[model samples]
Structure formats: structure tokens, C-alpha cells
Target: GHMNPPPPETSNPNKPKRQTNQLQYLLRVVLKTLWKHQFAWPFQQPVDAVKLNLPDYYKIIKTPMDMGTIKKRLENNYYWNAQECIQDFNTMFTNCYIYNKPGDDIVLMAEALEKLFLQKINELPTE
Candidate 1:
């Protein structure tokens, strides 16, 4: 005989009522912490050379399904599809930042670093 466990208790008399899902609670904390620590500023600017306006991007960010979609992705990692979302966010940022070719130039920076390091090493004495 297969035994099935009872459904999780929705309400607990001994504890305070939780207004939201625990997953959401943790994600909210993480999102807030990210914002408090300047989550996008550093990454966003580096992605595009021109310093984009955070306030402008924030306007697009604050008015959408950002929280709900992020919560769903965080909650269900197995089915979280990010490509479309990433594309949409990219488009939004493109418009917000007024950059037609907005993309991270990481390879360029890496190559520059590599050249600098090799040059610096070459300049050092062999002895």
C-alpha cells in the first residue's frame, strides 16, 4: 500500500501568518540586497561603454512583470527560460540607454589585459 503525506499546512496557529511564499520571501531579501549593493550599475555600465542612465532604465524596470517573472524563475529553476526574457530586457535597455549597438565588450577588455600583462612581463629583466 502506498501512503501519501498530507498537504502542507497553510496556516499555523503557533506562528505568525506568512503573507507570501517562502521562496518569494528569500528572493525578495536577495533582490533588496542586490539593489542595496548596486547590482546593475557596475555590470550595466561595463556592458556598454557609454554610461547609461540608471534612473531611465529603472523606469522601464519598475513598471513591468519584473518581480513576478524573476520570482517564477527563482522558484522553478528546471523550467526557467531566460533567453526570451534576456532578449526583451536587452531591447528595453537598448531603448532606455539610447545605444543602437549595446553589447558587452568583454573580449576586447580581456585582450587588452592580456597584451598589457605580456608587455609588462617582457619589460622585466630576464636575470
Candidate 2:
């Protein structure tokens, strides 16, 4: 009846609660670290294609994701797993690469942000 099949490690009724608590608690740490990445501000909000006069940008990057949107999703408990949030992060970076020229400041910073974000994920504590 629940949303997922129990993991091989899960045991007893409390296991589910503990797992939820562990993932939720640990995921926040990753988000917090990303928020501070120096190059991350560019991705903190949706790009203003019209303001930049790059209206064609929206045509290429369908889902223009950003850190601010990801944070809001977290605040709303919009993600059920780590993968979901990372998808948005990757999409955000991918959009940068697709629309912006290589070696641009924003693209370079996104490279750093993605690298650091992955490292932080490895730091998470859980089975």
C-alpha cells in the first residue's frame, strides 16, 4: 500500500520512518552546501530570456530549471528522493551548456557547482 517496496535493508515498521528521516535530514545538508557555491547565483532563478534578448533560448531549453526553484521544491517537500532533485540540477546545468557558449562564466561556474554537488552527495550518511 505504501509508495515503494521496502529496501533490502529495511526491517520492522520503524525502518521506514527512520529511512525517511535519514534521507530528509541528509538531503538538506547537500542543498545547503550547494546554496553557497559561489558560481551558483546565476542558476538561482530562471533566466530572463526576453531581458537578455535571447528569446530563442526557451526554444532550446524546455525546462529552464534553477537553484531557487529547487529550493522552493524542497521547502514544499516536492522531492521524494535524492534523484529527483539532482535531475533538476543537471537539467539546469545542461541548459547552461546548451544555450551559452563554452567557457562562459556561468557555464564554468555550473561545472564547479555540479562537481561540488556530487561530492556533497557522497558525504551523505546512510546505508
Candidate 3:
């Protein structure tokens, strides 16, 4: 649906991103599910601060978020484990909730996306 960068090869002698493939694969599945959602197109790229011209956008949203930014972080081994990945997911959705009017469909999409993500995470019995 979007320009997804290739998944890291499991064959890596490069041990970082290829960390056991289990967590990496789970992250990829969550991302694929999220991107499959209709609301995620707006979230694929970071929020445009200057172009959108919302004066308080930065002040209100301490952390701006997007799908691919977090994905890239995974590539760099920024996530030591699943909790960090989950935290980033929360940050992304909550930023959407905070910036947009709660009643609007846009924010609902964020909320819905979050629910789907949370459900998927529950499927994993990671110790």
C-alpha cells in the first residue's frame, strides 16, 4: 500500500537488526496491519509542522510521530525489545489524539489503530 522498505534479511551475519527474527517479525506484522488501515495514510509520514501551519502543533505534541520513522528506528536496533516498540506505538497514537479534535473521524482512526495494535501484541506470549 505504501513504499515499504525491505525487511531486514534473517540471514544477517549482521546481528543487530536480525535480532532473533521473532520480535522483528512481530513488529513487521503490526506495521503491516496498521498500514492496512485506511486512517494510516495520514500517519505514514511525519506531521508537517510548517506546511500545515498549526501554531501550537509542536508545543502540544512534544513528540511528533509517523509509521516509517519508528520502522527506521527498528532497523537501527533502537528498540532493544518489544516494550520500546509498544511505547513508540503509544506515542504515535496519543499524538494524534492530542492534536486533533476528539470527535473527529481522524482521531478515531488513531484510536482504532491503537486498539488493533494492542490486540495483536496480546497474541504474543513473549517472556
lDDT of each: 0.34, 0.67, 0.70
- lDDT measured at residue 33 in model 1 versus the true structure, 0 to 100: 37
Candidate of highest lDDT: 3
Q: Provide the TM-score for each candidate, comma-separated.
A: 0.22, 0.74, 0.75
| Cα lDDT for residue 65, candidate 1 | 24
Lowest summed lDDT over 10 consecutive residues: which window, candidate 3?
1-10
Predicted model with the maximum TM-score: 3
The deviation in Å at residue 20 for candidate 2 is 3.1
Off by over 4 Å in 3: 1-22, 125-127
- 63-113 per-residue lDDT for model 3 (tens digits): 666787766666666555677667777888888887899779878888888
Cα lDDT over the full model 1:
0.34
Q: Which 10 consecutive positions of candidate 2 have the poorest summed lDDT?
A: 1-10
For model 2, name the residue pairs that clash.
none
Clashes of each: 0, 0, 0
